[model samples]
Target chain A: DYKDDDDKLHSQANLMRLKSDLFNRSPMYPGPTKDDPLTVTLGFTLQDIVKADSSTNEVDLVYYEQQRWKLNSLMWDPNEYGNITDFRTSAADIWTPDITAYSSTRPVQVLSPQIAVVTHDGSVMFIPAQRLSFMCDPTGVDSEEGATCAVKFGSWVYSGFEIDLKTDTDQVDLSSYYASSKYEILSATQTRQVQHYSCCPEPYIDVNLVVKFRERR
Target chain B: DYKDDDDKLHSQANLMRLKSDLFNRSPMYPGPTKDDPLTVTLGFTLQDIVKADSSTNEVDLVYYEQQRWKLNSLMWDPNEYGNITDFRTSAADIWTPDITAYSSTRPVQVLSPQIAVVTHDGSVMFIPAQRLSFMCDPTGVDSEEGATCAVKFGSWVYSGFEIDLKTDTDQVDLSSYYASSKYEILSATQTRQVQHYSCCPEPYIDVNLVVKFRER
Candidate 1:
């Protein structure tokens, strides 16, 4: 739909958008305290992502996407397997992220255990978490030694600190900021920040790539 | 000398309004066979009560009034002679607090090693985790900072997302679909995916907090 019928170009091109409605609730739940929790965490271990595509002889974004898709399914599958007791005993079928990338946080942002804090950082300062590509199994204990294992998941100390931001001070309304930078900013991309993976499945990465939601604007 | 009706009334009127009687019975765990655990990252740290207590040296109440009362009990005193050992673990799997309230014996309403579920007012909502109705003890801390004496629990963090619990059925609903529970802390745990809160015996200030166990 980028063509204005003459094919002279209308400026909207090259990106993708993914959107969907409120999941898990067709009729929704009933309640006075209807406001649900905001953020969640993933219990996904680094091991899960690396072992996704072993036959390919290498671990890359291809593995992360496939693993991400499956893990995403497991997250909402209310019953772990077939029964409540089954769910009780085994936590294998729970939500977990399946990739590692650069930490996309700005110097001054407000975040919670579950929410992705939209930052004052622009595209210039924003570098997604380092992507993973490994020659051998990255999660193996004797894993990284003999192979050319590119870094998949590890802490990346970026250019700043986790400074507390404020409205009159550090707050940058992204919608406003981007519109102002018409000449400079080409386009803001969207992404997910799968920060930490713990055994308990703390997948606190709740915020998705904002621009993906056409209605967000 | 107590009649059955009188006994029932008295028991019901006791400290907690908790009905452990119906916690997991009658088969009451609800949710669809779907959860989406994806797209999340903590790009911020909250500078609240717990985080602030971490930096300063003073044993004062610059935060919550009730929280202040409990913290003041743990201050090093630059005064007391001895020290209390291991808040990380000595506090867990145990019966009571290292220090009880200054008044009433056993803090009046402590649920004990059911320690994860007590409150002076018993202001708690029980949620099922792996079938166990994990209690919210005013005594627990975020276990991520190593084990603490008080029982610990974890809950999903909420911002733009949250679980909408149905009133009639008490089932969980999503914020705006796609992936809610995945980003939600399904239940509290003794392991990772935890934030912070330190619940333990105040070092150097020890009280015999455990004594009412049928089976320790």
Candidate 2:
């Protein structure tokens, strides 16, 4: 798990280098198409993956992943992500209790995110499918409700990652850490791709991290 | 709304027929690997889609969908699918709610599930990543809490559900059905392919329904 933390930390290490010096940074954009329907969970960002403090200042191996869901769960300003609308128009949200930075969270991520959870009671299910989000800016202000920040998985973004799985089992939830540097059984690193865009923090991200599990062991 | 009831009823009718009478039914399984990560919610079954009353043979179009947020909101039992530990082992779920059966339901599926909803303070934004599920097997334990069946979206079963979008905008949620037969402006049909096993009921399903939306 420690290595997994660092592995993600490495990605942030690069992105972090970008965030700290904005005027010196570059803005990356890309081409579009009606050619695809995405499945990835609009993966993580440098701040989302790396802990704010510098000592344990690196990635909080423990909270490394817990933040994936944290960022996506933040309420959207709509205006921020290329759109203009109320935050909670129709759907409620995908995850609950709003995501908190991880400490020792299990049921970490589901093998399959688009199905229902049976309750040993009258049965009913929910969706918008797979969830896990973070709504804080961490680096931003923590004022009143809106003062802090409320974000959920917004529009798509791009990032480079290399996904390597050792065991052929296809359960890709956060619990398994498909892109982990820790769980050697699966021996993962990151999503497979070079980021359609160049190396820009906002430009590159792994949507595959928000993958749908295609098979079982 | 009654028309909406019949729409989803059809998808269930076919899938249900295979469930109750397997002898005369078929097994719809397929192959895979490094293939794809899916997000089509395995929405409600015939029962959960039905209203609380037995007198009305209608699809409780209203209750026809309460199951959306109900499942992802559930806790899991990891022991059944794979692994060898606690049934509640790992992963809480990915989606929140909103995804429902396609019409009663077709385009009953969406391309993307985990985006945002415009307005509803303290409300949610579901995705194809998680979905509406009918966890009740009314044919079986109509018991209290339905003890005989506490199922999960375990295996991959293939059903003949096609997801066609009537509009270009991808707001694939229960609020906007993706699979519609007549091709209503924004209506829909269902998700793509089957789960991976025979189209068995309890044995196979898409768990993209129950999800956990974490806040930053």
Candidate 3:
């Protein structure tokens, strides 16, 4: 009868407490120590090919990307929170990856809502549908060998020591791909990179994606 | 409203009429003429690899397969029939493809529910989750080159004249693939095949899928 008395008010209390507890924990890595870097698993699925402009040697691609990470500070006991196991919040309300396409000609455009799903154990999943345009060789786009394009993504401010980025799968997912009428994606593969700059001794990690596509006959 | 009078009874009447009309039209090709064969678009996504035994030279594969085709005779006027655009029926209730894995060691085992979704335009979609064990060279399964396995699917009874098979996409789909700890899939590609046997003068068409995988 306690739940039935004010279920609506009870849920509001849980939300307020959960948000206040985790929102204050941001602005820094939530790892137990400075040496323990936060590990993030990134995955992408190509949704469509908006355009493959051979004239400008550029391609407009659309895809859905997912970033997952664990925050110990965000964890809470479900029993204490009215049995609520998870909740959805705005991306601005919590810390997210500054994943940038370093090779893109234009800035990434988010086409879908940027809501993050947070679970009881502190696991967070953020899926954003985005569009990107990058330069590549369009001459061999009609051949079976297809044209090759490389897009590199990494954290802008964090190095390998602060945020360790990892691939969720060996191959770039193609199961949810919608076939383009003009061009067909032959294959997409990913490789992780760790680079050391002369200005900074700490190494930075990035995911380099190589895509191959050809004109449809 | 008329729908409120006997909604359940009305739905039963619609289903009975629809089934009687389409179910009887089966057991024979539903094309306009014998010369015009039914064209089926087939697609498959590899879901998992149950086992890859080098000693047995065989691999157990699980996948979801979709087969789509059109039957003009099954079309209905949705407005007159309560605007029911589609319905689900058993594989036995309606005609379906006899798609067979010609190289499998054992018969295919369906793992999920098999239901056919029939739209108003007579566009039928049948997706079945199935598993099969086929022979392949298990050597070089750990290298980047990976071991290649080929499985061909086609109608067992019907030739190209009665039914034609085609690929839905140029490349095999891997979007929902779950990474296996022991194996990594390198690539999956498909090719269309047409062969003419000496006993049968008519040509037969099939879809040949080639999968490359290596030890993770």
List the pairs of residues colliding in candidate 3: A174-B175, A175-B174, A175-B175
User: Can you list each candidate's DockQ?
Assistant: 0.02, 0.02, 0.01
lDDT of 1 by residue, B36-143 (tens): 111111111101111111111111101110111111112222112122211221222222211112111011222222323322221221221111111111111233
How well is each residue in B1-216 modelled by candidate 2, as lDDT tens digits?
556434334333433332233223233222221232223333421111212222332112111121222222222232321221111101122233222333231122222222332111212223223222233322321433321212223222332232211112222234322121111122222222234455544223332222111111
**Local distance difference test, per candidate?**
0.20, 0.24, 0.74
lDDT per residue as tens, model 3, A33-128: 346568778788875555677778878776777788888767999888667666666677777878888878777766555667788998888877
lDDT of 2 by residue, A100-151 (tens): 1211111133223333221212121223222233212222112222112212
Lowest lDDT sum, 10 consecutive residues, model 1 chain A, at A10-19
Q: For all the candidates, what are their Cα RMSDs to the real structure?
A: 25.3, 26.1, 20.3
DockQ result, candidate 2: 0.02
Candidate 1: what is its chain A TM-score? 0.17
- Tens digits of per-residue lDDT, candidate 1, A101-189, equal 33322121111011111111100011111123444432332232222232223212210121111112121123222121101111223
TM-score of each: 0.20, 0.19, 0.48
Q: How many steric overlaps are in each model, in order?
A: 55, 135, 3
lDDT of 3 at A57: 80
Candidate 2 off by > 4 Å: A1-63, A66-186, A191-217, B1-128, B135-216
**lDDT winner, 1 or 3:** 3
